[PDB]
Design a protein around this ligand. Sequence first.
Ligand SMILES: Nc1ncnc2c1ncn2[C@@H]1O[C@H](CSCC[C@H](N)C(=O)O)[C@@H](O)[C@H]1O
Ligand SMILES: NC[C@H](O)c1ccc(O)c(O)c1
Length: 257
Amino acid sequence: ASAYQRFEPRAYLRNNYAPPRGDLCNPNGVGPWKLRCLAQTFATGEVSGRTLIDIGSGPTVYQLLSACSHFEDITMTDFLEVNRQELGRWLQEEPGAFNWSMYSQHACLIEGKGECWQDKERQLRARVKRVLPIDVHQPQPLGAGSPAPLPADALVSAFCLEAVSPDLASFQRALDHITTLLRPGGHLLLIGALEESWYLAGEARLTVVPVSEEEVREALVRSGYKVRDLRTYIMPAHLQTGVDDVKGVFFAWAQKV
Ligand SMILES: Nc1ncnc2c1ncn2[C@@H]1O[C@H](CSCC[C@H](N)C(=O)O)[C@@H](O)[C@H]1O
Ligand SMILES: NC[C@H](O)c1ccc(O)c(O)c1
């Protein structure tokens, strides 16, 4: 965990959200894939409510681009201050913000509503009410008296659990912890790395619990979810870059039952 104390947002963003992985022109890439899973899921209209919490946001917003048009109160979270500050820089359109415009444009492209990407960003910024500290290892990840409306109507989390858990069992308990935040009958949208064991974020070198699709499903069942959808992206050679050893990426749409 203390390895995270050297985690550099700019290097992480650069490693995973700038080209090649961040060049969204090719439809077969990991970015378009993640965006499509999220867009398709929200477009069903079965994932809706008023409040939504993004677990372990780090310095990234793409995971909420499609979500924002379905929830008016969105809470973002992360363990590190440096990430919350990096989010703050984009939310407030401050200087040095990361350029997500490519992801915004593609989300609009995929959603097919003819929406311009400026309106999409504008709606996301407006709907993000707060950026909170969080620790998924705590049985109450947000704390005692969090400004966050609980229980949330839906959860979104991307590349968080498997990256903060030393092994399978911890991954399972972390899921249990955040699951307490989710109202019964609510929805979790979980994106994660498959069979990955490390990734780099500048000077920091983070350990990852390698998980498989079935381990992810069993763990969702165990935590009390009905798995509505579970999908896999295999990482093409051209997007394997020396910043990690990720083998694939998974997307799960789970419902608390
Ligand atoms: N104990 C913890 N609980 C919740 N988040 C944690 C955590 N320890 C580290 N994190 C955060 O986990 C994030 C993993 S990187 C994920 C960024 C974004 N969700 C994505 O789709 O890219 C980092 O921002 C990191 O600080
Ligand atoms: N820890 C997450 C992992 O390093 C990762 C792999 C591929 C990605 O496209 C990504 O966003 C994150």
